């Protein structure tokens, strides 16, 4: 790390600078998904795959 850049927190490409999503913004988007998800018991997208 810190010679290649730790990769984007919300994508592929584990190594790279990439000008990613900021981690504080990452956490905010995450918790927004959390309470919007548990807001009314929303079925997980994965079984919408299945």
């Amino acid at each position: 790390l810190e010679i290649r850049g730790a990769g984007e927190l919300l994508g592929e490409e584990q190594s790279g600078s990439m000008e990613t999503i900021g981690f504080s913004l990452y956490m905010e988007l995450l918790e927004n998904a959390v309470d919007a998800l548990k807001a009314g018991r929303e079925p997980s997208l994965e079984d919408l795959t299945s």
């Binding site: 000008e19 900021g22 981690f23 504080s24 913004l25």
Partner: protein, 36 residues
């Protein structure tokens, strides 16, 4: 407005008095929203 200059070592108390906060995270600019 002033008459002399003084140089000295900086005590941690004076560095805290100079500073109006303290930085935690290394990210510069979001650059999608240009707010810092």
């Amino acid at each position: 407005e002033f008459d002399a200059i003084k140089i000295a070592l900086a005590s941690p108390d004076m560095i805290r008095s100079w500073s109006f906060g303290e930085v935690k995270k290394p990210e510069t600019i979001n650059y999608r929203t240009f707010k810092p």
